[PDB]
Write a protein that binds this ligand. Structure first.
Ligand SMILES: O=C(O)[C@@H](CO)OP(=O)(O)O
Ligand code: NA
Ligand code: NA
Length: 436
């Protein structure tokens, strides 16, 4: 048609925010000599067996085996050719062409990282050549033209990592992530300011307790002091909330990502909730969370509180706390529609952490979110531990109408750029009268 069609894709090995290679894709379109868009894939700290296969070179002489030249070559030689001449206005067809080209359930022929990077860049290109905001382009793809026409938009509530334990830190605290959430009913610019101020105060509090090194940050910008218990962590966070001038349980709420698979022993069936000290059954773990919420009633969400296949544990956790708090499946689901269907039917949990690159394309990720939306459960659009300059998940969370984003502390460029993109979106929505 020559109007808004793909001329070619060009792949490139770049560095992600952890300094490891990842795939970046340029899209050429409309006969234009310079790319109309560029986006890149994120990367988690680990990739398992129910997720899109992240294709790495394994050449120990480059990037300690983590190069992505093979995946990049698949962009240039296969995936590019599969979308050449196709319209940038139909994201579903573009994503299906990528899926079909690879032809493997786990995307292990061409590489999930190549496919996600192409999906991101092609969606970014489609919005660019239509001279429209990316979240609008994604909203139209998610809802269809008829529901999109008069659609209004909401900004998410951010779940903001500010303190880390587990594998991240040197203490015996095993819960991996402690987050703050600002109250829902206020402008997004005030949500951002609130969590940024709490984050600054926590850093100063920790630097007073332990000196300058205590303000060094982990991969997602959170602090990693040496702590023993979740109560210690939550008490520091509550202190920072107060120093910022906010009220715990009114202005600022708390959330956990236990990453509990990391401290579960499947032979003993015990959770090592305090390193080399305390070992709990599934049932005792649920009771532990119940009492932690009693002591800290501002806790409104717990992610991966039980191990990824401890389905009897999850059923009970959701039985006992599901009416009060979000129970977020991350490892529980790995953005996998087979698991999501089973978890909805069996009532494992009541929310999904959505990682597009775990499933592959944006379209595949939208179907997963739809299943959750369809039963009144919550979608939290998530970063990965290795992020890039692409801010697409900010446009995605608004475009699909999900209530929450989880994209790091208010520090490090690959985290704050997502908050800044949402600040831009909020202004655009206000200016055009699209704010719901
Ligand atoms: O566990 C998670 O929610 C994400 C980041 O917080 O981790 P990773 O990308 O390493 O899977
Ligand atoms: Na540790
Ligand atoms: Na997680």
């Amino acid at each position: 048609g020559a109007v808004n069609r793909v001329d070619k894709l060009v792949g490139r090995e770049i560095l992600d925010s952890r300094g490891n290679p990842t795939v970046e894709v340029d899209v050429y379109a409309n006969g234009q000599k310079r790319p109309v868009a560029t986006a890149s894939a994120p990367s988690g700290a680990s990739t398992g067996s129910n997720e899109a296969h992240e294709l790495r070179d394994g050449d120990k002489s480059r990037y300690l085996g983590k190069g992505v030249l093979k995946a990049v070559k698949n962009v240039n030689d296969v995936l590019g050719k599969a979308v050449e001449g196709k319209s940038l206005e139909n994201l579903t067809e573009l994503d299906q062409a990528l899926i079909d080209a690879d032809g493997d359930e786990l995307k292990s022929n061409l590489g999930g990282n190549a496919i996600t990077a192409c999906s991101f860049a092609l969606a970014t290109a489609g919005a660019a050549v239509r001279n429209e905001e990316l979240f609008l382009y994604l909203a139209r793809a998610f809802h269809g033209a008829d529901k999109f026409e008069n659609l209004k938009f909401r900004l998410p509530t951010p779940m903001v990592n500010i303190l880390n334990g587990g594998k991240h830190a040197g203490g015996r605290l095993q819960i991996q992530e402690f987050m703050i959430l600002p109250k829902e009913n206020q402008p997004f610019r005030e949500k951002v300011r609130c969590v940024a101020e709490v984050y600054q105060h926590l850093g100063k509090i920790l630097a007073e307790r332990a000196g300058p090194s205590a303000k060094n940050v982990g991969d997602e910008g959170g602090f990693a002091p040496n702590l023993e218990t979740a109560d210690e962590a939550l008490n520091y966070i509550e202190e920072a909330i107060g120093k910022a001038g906010y009220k715990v349980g009114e202005d600022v709420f708390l959330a956990l990502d236990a990453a509990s698979s990391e401290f579960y022993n499947s032979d003993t069936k015990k959770y090592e909730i305090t390193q080399q000290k305390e070992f709990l059954t599934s049932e005792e773990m649920v009771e532990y969370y119940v009492q932690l919420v009693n002591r800290h009633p501002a806790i409104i969400s717990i992610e991966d509180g039980l191990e990824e296949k401890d389905y009897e544990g999850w059923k009970l956790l959701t039985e006992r706390l599901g009416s009060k708090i979000m129970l977020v499946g991350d490892d529980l689901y790995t953005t996998n529609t087979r698991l999501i269907k089973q978890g909805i039917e069996e009532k494992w949990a009541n929310a999904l952490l959505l990682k597009v690159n775990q499933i592959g394309t944006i379209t595949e990720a939208m179907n997963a979110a739809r299943m959750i939306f369809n039963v009144g459960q919550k979608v939290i659009v998530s970063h990965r531990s290795g992020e890039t300059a692409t801010t697409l998940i900010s446009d995605l969370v608004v475009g699909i109408g999900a209530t929450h984003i989880k994209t790091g502390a208010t520090a490090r460029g690959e985290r704050v750029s997502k908050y800044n993109r949402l600040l831009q979106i909020e202004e655009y929505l206000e200016q055009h009268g699209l704010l719901a």
